[PDB]
């Protein structure tokens, strides 16, 4: 019986367009990609490991 209530809870949800969500996530992956050592390895001196 709770599932009917649970489904009713999720029946009305504010939904964002998948195209809009994709673009925002793409920008979040675009503007924030600069500070990513995995994307571009830094100097062995800068990297504590190497």
């Amino acid at each position: 019986r709770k599932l009917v209530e649970q489904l009713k809870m999720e029946a009305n949800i504010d939904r964002i367009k998948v195209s809009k969500a994709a673009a925002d996530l793409m920008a979040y992956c675009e503007a924030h990609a600069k500070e990513d050592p995995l994307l571009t390895p830094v100097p062995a001196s800068e990297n504590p490991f190497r």
Binding site: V4, Q6, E10, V18, A21, M26, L38, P48
Partner: protein, 328 residues
């Protein structure tokens, strides 16, 4: 009777299909590929008794904690490659591990249906309200600890109180992995019944519940933006869901890939998704381009866990061969 819930299920599915306007791959096609990525073991971390099941980066990123089936829990200093503290676990078998954002306490799970938090600076408390084995433990602060168990009920304990403050229950299958978001408000938990639902710590109600996969869900992790997360099924396919869209954004799967998935973790920028397997290799795929970029297979046995530091400097990966390789 139950048809209304089935009608509601059809109504929910209709909204998601209607909300779908364009495909992620179509939008991400113009995005330039990351290219081939080669990783090496800048450190070769090893020296444990038996096969390990968990690994978790510290908040300061200097230390990592790994727990093995041998019952020995040891916190390992990545830079010096020298073990810092080795604390034995009362339970013979452990299934999960966690590290404090403050770094004061280290939490180790257990298959003995009891969760215990250890004090680095002497076990502090033992929690056993949940039934069955504990799947994943992770606590945002030194007061609230989130553990997902095999009783299909994940609850957030109070470290000071030692009792279940709230209970997030009603999940179909056994919960196998729990992931916390940087916002610390909402957390997504994955169960063995292919259902991936995101809870709210204060509300205690499943705001969204996704069931895109067919097989059991193995692990889940959030993106840095905290608006989406990725999960890996027991089937070869792993998918990423956009919370605001409540749908499966992109399906990640290679025809050659047929083995199981045991871990999942994004990068600091989130572009590079590193996915472990039972095929002794970890594959790093582009989150936006939805294509495989590079593979690494340093481990010899099945990879158990994988994580990325808060700073994002380098990735770690577990292994059932007792050798955890710190890739960079």
């Amino acid at each position: 009777l139950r048809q209304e819930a089935e009608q509601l299920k059809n109504q929910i599915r209709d909204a998601r299909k209607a909300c779908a306007d364009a495909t992620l791959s179509q939008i991400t096609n113009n995005i330039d590929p990351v290219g081939r990525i080669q990783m090496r073991t800048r450190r070769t971390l090893r020296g444990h008794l038996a096969k390990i099941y968990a690994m978790h980066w510290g908040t300061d990123s200097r230390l990592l904690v790994s727990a093995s089936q041998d019952g020995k829990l040891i916190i390992w200093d990545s830079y010096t490659t020298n073990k810092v503290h080795a604390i034995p676990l009362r339970s013979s078998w452990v299934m999960t591990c966690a590290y404090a954002p403050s770094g004061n306490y280290v939490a180790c799970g257990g298959l003995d249906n009891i969760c215990s938090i250890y004090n680095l600076k002497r076990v502090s408390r033992e929690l056993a309200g949940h039934t069955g084995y504990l799947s994943c433990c992770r606590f945002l602060d030194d007061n609230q600890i989130v553990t997902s168990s095999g009783d299909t009920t994940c609850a957030l304990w109070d470290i000071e109180t030692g009792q279940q403050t709230t209970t997030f229950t009603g999940h179909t299958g056994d919960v196998m992995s729990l992931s916390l978001a940087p916002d610390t408000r909402l957390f997504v938990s994955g169960a063995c019944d292919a259902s991936a639902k995101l809870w709210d710590v204060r509300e205690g109600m499943c705001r969204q519940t996704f069931t895109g996969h067919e097989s059991d869900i193995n692990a889940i992790c959030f993106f840095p933006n905290g608006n989406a997360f990725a999960t890996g099924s027991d089937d070869a396919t792993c998918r990423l869901f956009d919370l605001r869209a409540d749908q499966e954004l992109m399906t990640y799967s290679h025809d050659n890939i047929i083995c199981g998935i045991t871990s999942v973790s994004f990068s600091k920028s989130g572009r590079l998704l590193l996915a472990g397997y039972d095929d002794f290799n970890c594959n790093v795929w582009d989150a936006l381009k939805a294509d495989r970029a590079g593979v690494l297979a340093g481990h010899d046995n099945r990879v158990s866990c994988l994580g990325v530091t808060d700073d994002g400097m380098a990735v770690a990966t577990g292994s059932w061969d007792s050798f955890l390789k710190i890739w960079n």
